[PDB]
Amino acid sequence: VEPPNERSLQITMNQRDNSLYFQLFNNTNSVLAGNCKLKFTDAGDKPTTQIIDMGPHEIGIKEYKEYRYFPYALDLEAGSTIEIENQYGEVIFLGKYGSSPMINLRPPSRLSAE
Q1: Whole-angstrom Cα distance, residue 21 to residue 49?
Q2: Residues near 62 by Cβ (< 8 Å), separated by ≥ 6?
Q3: Which structural domains are found in the chain, ordered by start?
């Protein structure tokens, strides 16, 4: 069974008039790093080149951030996948969108498992 103290990362989305907002909620028990970038996508089938930057600023635990991009008058759909590419350039957390704006993320690659 998966290891304990196994937290995750949630990210909320909110599309407005030719614009899209993405909120983060470091639910981890460690801490978030900066100089990261976001690799959000409308849905996944035929998304856009929507690419946001996390800036050099980092995020802490139980923290929170709000990134706004544009233009973007699209229509979010169930599938909107996201990816947080740290300074390294390799996504660490990813998650899709659905009914709710906020959806768990988690790494696309396993970390450890007994």
Answers
A1: 15
A2: 25, 26, 27
A3: 1-114 (2.60.40.2830)
